[PDB]
From a paper:
Glucosidase I removes the outermost α1,2-linked glucose from the D1 branch, and then glucosidase II (GII) trims second and third α1,3-linked glucose residues by catalyzing hydrolyses at the Glc-α1,3-Glc and Glc-α1,3-Man glycosidic linkages. Here we performed an X-ray crystallographic study of GIIα to elucidate its substrate recognition mechanism. The overall structure of GIIα is composed of four major domains and three subdomains: N-terminal domain (residues 31–384), subdomain B1 (residues 207–256), β8α8 barrel domain (residues 385–737), subdomain B2 (residues 484–526), subdomain B3 (residues 559–581), proximal C-terminal domain (residues 738–823), and distal C-terminal domain (residues 824–977). Taken together, our structural data revealed that GIIα can recognize two kinds of glucosylated substrates, Glc-α1,3-Glc and Glc-α1,3-Man, via a bilocular substrate-binding pocket with a tolerant +1 subsite.
We expressed the recombinant GIIα (residues 31–977) in Escherichia coli and crystallized it by the hanging-drop vapor diffusion method. The crystal belongs to space group R32 with one molecule per asymmetric unit. The final model of GIIα refined to 1.40 Å resolution has an Rwork of 15.4% and Rfree of 17.5%. The tris(hydroxymethyl)aminomethane (Tris) molecule derived from the crystallization reagent, also known as an α-glucosidase inhibitor, was accommodated in the putative active-site pocket located at the center of β8α8 barrel domain. The Tris molecule was bound to the pocket in the 1.40-Å-resolution crystal structure. Similar to DNJ, it interacted with Asp443, Asp556, Arg617, Asp633, and His691 through hydrogen bonds. The α1 helix covers a β sheet comprising β12, β17, and β18, and, the preceding 11-residue-long segment is accommodated in the putative active site pocket of β8α8 barrel domain, suggesting its involvement in substrate binding. A unique subdomain (termed B1) is found in the N-terminal domain of GIIα but not in the other GH31s. In subdomain B1, residues 215–235 are completely disordered, suggesting its flexible nature. In this domain, a continuous twisted β strand (β43) connects the β sheets with β42 and β44, forming a β-barrel-like structure. These C-terminal domains appear to be responsible for the stabilization of the β8α8 barrel domain rather than for substrate binding, given that no interactions between these C-terminal domains and the active-site pocket were observed.
Residue numbers in the entry: 29 to 214, 236 to 898, 902 to 977
């Protein structure tokens, strides 16, 4: 590695963070503090779902003002948007220092990058009341939501169900740093040039941060703003036992040996926060791409939040501030977690339909050293009956760190290697990063430069800095021209050695710059549009993943298929583009434990296709740690083992017995559940539903679930997992959320019924703690195969899990896994309902029964086995069920097994013989 001992700005070393914390400190200390911002009421108009007005900020004691245009939008979804800009900058009436050509206006293209829907204004929104001091707009479903805009001082309260839920500027922390010239007087130490990390930011605009206090009234838990090594329920940041002392930071960065339990930034940022309490949820999305900090405090609503004499109800106070751009905030009023995340996904995108194979097990390290190493690992996985889908090539596969090349010594036959993988339906993933080596005899860099596709410096020169290849330039993927050029580099006939099973890993896209400040670009670099790097930093990774995504749609004439791209850096909207992982984690138990809250936070922030490196990246995991890590990793939506260059080889067959057998059983469970995992991804695509779901999401009425972040439900299955993540543990305590019956997935032991509680479950090394909730049906594939592609035509097993209602529902989505034919209806989506002794299968969307090639071939694929857990006693002695499908009726044998000790009664129907694409009805009893 280049950097050994890294320097990260603490809040006090970030000028605009210092200024905004100081602004908060002053406002909280001041007596009868009034925000110096007022709506000029005569400038206001409401029409057709939108309020527009001028906020006047008073900027000195003479009462001089600047004009800050306000726009409040009320969207058909019931979401609201509040935007504040700065008129002098809209007009261009400022002067940038240093003869800079940077844009004068406040960055206003975050919307262009992030927002894909949800923007229709609600012409049903209406002013309920309006005088010279305030106005209330009714909006949302049946006009149930209200926003009360107070003019002087400016504030907005967002209300429903007879209460305020979210307040803007209640504490008076609104801060829009208006443009000023650099003048010596007739505290400005952070206003202009700032130095850190071996770099001086020329700061041509001076101060321009935007900040606001957002209060969540009556909420004691807030969630989101990934990525951090931190609990799902976010910590306070202004001190106290078990709290942080610095704000959560979002400034995508390459953080060497990142630590646990910290508000420090990691590699990606999604500035979306939710607040949840029993039966009420709200949220905000802060649409800003610049460095952003969020302070969080909790206490009573009184100015001294520890005062006596006041009601105890807790308000969570949050203080958001970004270096530049618009103040631009979306407000979600729920009332459930599912509602909020759905509405957020309508705005920023749902999860892309994945390549099916990408849900399988990925095998990676730094590095497989040759094409022969790759082919050998492939063979050994099969020798050891460990299924996997993809083998990965880290940076040593390239010729001297030039992307779009292969090391000729070590990778002489990449097509041969590809074809070997293709023999089991397996894939290859190759790393490609945004740093393009600055060297002679390299057409990729020649074109990057001559076509003006590289990121620029403060004076418009091509930026140069160091990364893996040494001296490099960076693709400016903000430029559509750069994205279009990038597409051309990936065609199979151009990127020699690649073929139809080759997909792509994007890394170091924060961007990582080894000699740059905080290992990234200078803030005064310039991008396409003449935006400063400060304006757009948190978007950078996403623009690069975007470029690569679009490059993989078609790589030869007539091809049109789903990309698979892994990214390190990301933003709101990256869910449209592929997977993420949590970067360079460490081979230790605390990082295994921490992975679960991190991966959960990803999904509730609308980017669920997420995982952590299995085994941990840095170091050498003990055999038990590695084994437990597989048992956790099979529940990551993105499931990959990876290891640092100095770490011992740890392909899973190297572990030794008994670990090999336990790891193989974990892999087989992941594969068996693939039908249900894929269906979970379908729901993420349809409406932004998380793939693995925390308790707050599934059980919004159960208050005790709010701080729980070590257990989760899988998709739409009712499967409740709590992996073991502690050394030498041989049992686990699972929180049972409700009064439903819960069954051990493996033994059908009844773990709980009738009442929410904590249950202790035996959990030796060989146990994966996994429960099945009553009321659910899920599909699996029992026949073990070497890869997901080799399962494609195999029969399904349905597991029907009954509680006392003897009623259940679930679903199964299947398609060709690769094309966009799903857009034209070429898929199977079954809704399974058990009710009144009958299991039925119907099309999920109610479509009437034109079959393409894939649908036709699926006519050979059946449901063959049904297992009913919690089978009623009345079925005892009955030797058949009656099956009806496609006009034919027949008996199928059923085996009834009575309850025994704590094991549930269960019944098994074998050789059901019904095609999965057809309606059916099966009557029991
Ligand atoms: Cl002005
Ligand atoms: Cl749910």
């Amino acid at each position: 590695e280049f950097v050994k001992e890294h320097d990260w700005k603490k809040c006090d070393q970030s000028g605009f963070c210092r200024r905004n914390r100081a602004y908060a400190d002053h406002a909280l200390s001041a007596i009868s503090w009034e925000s110096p911002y007022k709506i000029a009421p005569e400038t206001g108009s409401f029409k057709d779902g939108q309020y527009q007005a001028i906020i006047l900020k008073t900027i000195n004691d003479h009462g001089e003002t600047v004009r800050l245009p306000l726009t409040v939008s009320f969207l058909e979804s019931g979401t609201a948007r509040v935007t504040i800009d700065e008129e002098k900058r809209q007009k261009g009436e400022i002067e940038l220092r240093h003869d800079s050509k940077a844009r004068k206006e406040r960055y206003n293209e975050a919307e262009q990058w992030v927002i894909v829907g949800g923007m229709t204004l609600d012409k049903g929104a209406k002013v309920d009341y309006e005088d010279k001091t305030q106005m209330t707009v009714k909006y949302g479903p049946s006009s149930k939501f209200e926003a009360t805009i107070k003019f002087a001082p400016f504030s907005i309260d967002f209300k429903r169900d007879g209460a305020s839920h979210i307040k803007f500027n209640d504490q008076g922390l609104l801060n829009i740093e208006h443009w000023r010239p650099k003048i010596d007087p007739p505290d400005d130490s952070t206003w202009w040039e700032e130095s850190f990390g071996g770099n001086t930011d020329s700061k041509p605009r001076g101060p321009e941060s935007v900040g606001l206090d957002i209060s969540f009234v009556g909420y004691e838990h807030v969630f989101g703003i990934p990525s951090h090594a931190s609990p799902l329920s976010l910590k306070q940041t202004r001190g106290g036992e078990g709290n942080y002392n610095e704000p959560y930071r979002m400034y995508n960065a390459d953080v060497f040996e990142y630590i646990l339990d910290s508000p420090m930034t990691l590699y990606g940022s999604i500035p979306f926060m939710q607040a949840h309490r029993k039966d009420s949820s709200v949220g905000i999305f802060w649409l800003n791409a610049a460095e952003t900090w969020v302070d969080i405090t909790k206490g009573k609503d009184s100015k001294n939040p520890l005062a006596l004499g006041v009601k105890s109800k807790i308000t969570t106070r949050t203080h958001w501030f970004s270096e530049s751009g618009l103040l631009d905030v979306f407000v979600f009023l729920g009332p459930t977690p599912k509602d909020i995340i759905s509405k957020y996904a309508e705005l920023t995108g749902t999860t892309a339909m994945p390549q099916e194979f990408s849900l399988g097990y990925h095998q990676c390290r730094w590095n497989y050293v040759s094409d022969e190493d790759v082919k050998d690992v492939d063979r050994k996985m099969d020798k050891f009956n460990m299924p996997y889908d993809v083998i990965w090539l880290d940076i040593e596969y390239t010729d001297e760190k030039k992307y779009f090349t292969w090391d000729k010594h070590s990778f002489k036959d990449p097509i041969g290697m590809g074809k070997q993988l293709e023999a089991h339906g397996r894939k290859l993933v190759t790393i490609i990063d945004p740093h393009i080596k600055n060297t002679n005899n390299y057409p990729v860099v020649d074109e990057l430069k001559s076509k003006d596709l590289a990121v620029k410096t403060k004076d418009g020169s091509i930026f140069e800095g160091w990364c893996w290849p040494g001296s490099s330039h960076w693709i400016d993927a903000f430029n559509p021209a750069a994205r279009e050029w990038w597409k051309g580099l990936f065609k199979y006939d151009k990127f020699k050695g690649t073929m139809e099973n080759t997909f792509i890993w994007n890394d170091m896209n924060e961007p990582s710059v080894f000699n740059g400040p905080e290992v990234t670009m200078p803030k005064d670099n310039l991008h396409h549009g003449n935006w400063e790097h400060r304006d757009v930093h948190n978007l950078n990774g996403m623009t690069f993943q975007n470029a690569t995504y679009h490059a993989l749609l078609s790589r030869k004439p007539g091809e049109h298929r789903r990309p698979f791209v892994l990214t390190r850096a990301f933003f709101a909207g990256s869910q449209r583009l592929g997977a993420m992982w949590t970067g360079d984690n460490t081979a230790d138990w605390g990082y295994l434990k921490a992975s679960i809250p991190m991966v959960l936070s990803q999904g509730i922030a609308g980017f669920p296709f997420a995982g952590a490196d299995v085994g941990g990246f840095f170091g050498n995991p003990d055999k038990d740690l590695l084994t437990r890590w597989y048992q956790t990793g099979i529940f990551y939506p993105f499931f990959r083992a990876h290891a640092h260059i100095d770490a011992r080889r740890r392909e899973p067959y190297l572990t030794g017995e008994p670990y090999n057998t336990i790891i193989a059983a974990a892999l087989r469970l992941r594969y068996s559940l693939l039908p249900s995992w894929y269906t979970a991804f379908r729901h993420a695509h349809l409406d932004g539903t998380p793939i693995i779901k925390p308790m707050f999401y599934t059980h919004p009425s159960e208050e005790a679930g709010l701080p729980i972040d070590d257990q989760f439900f899988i998709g739409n299955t009712g499967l409740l997992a709590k992996p073991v993540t502690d050394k030498d543990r041989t049992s686990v305590d699972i929180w049972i959320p409700d009064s439903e019956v819960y069954y051990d997935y493996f033994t059908y032991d009844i773990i709980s019924a009738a009442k929410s509680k904590t249950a202790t479950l035996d959990a030796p090394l060989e146990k994966i703690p996994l429960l099945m909730r009553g009321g659910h049906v899920f599909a699996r594939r029992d026949i073990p195969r070497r890869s997901s592609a080799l399962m494609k035509w195999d029969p399904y097993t349905l597991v029907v899990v009954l509680g006392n209602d003897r009623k259940a529902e679930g679903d199964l989505y299947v398609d060709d896994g690769d094309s966009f034919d799903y857009e034209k209806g070429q898929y199977i989506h079954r809704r399974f309902i058990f009710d009144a002794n009958t299991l039925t299968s119907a099309d999920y969307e109610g479509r009437d029964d034109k079959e393409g090639e894939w649908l036709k071939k699926m006519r050979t694929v059946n449901v063959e086995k049904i297992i009913v857990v919690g089978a009623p006693a009345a079925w005892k002695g009955k030797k058949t069920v009656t099956v009806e499908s496609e006009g034919k009726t027949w008996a199928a044998a059923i085996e009834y097994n009575p309850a025994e000790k704590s094991r549930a009664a269960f019944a098994v129907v074998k050789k059901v013989g019904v095609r999965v694409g057809a309606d059916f009805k099966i009557v029991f009893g």
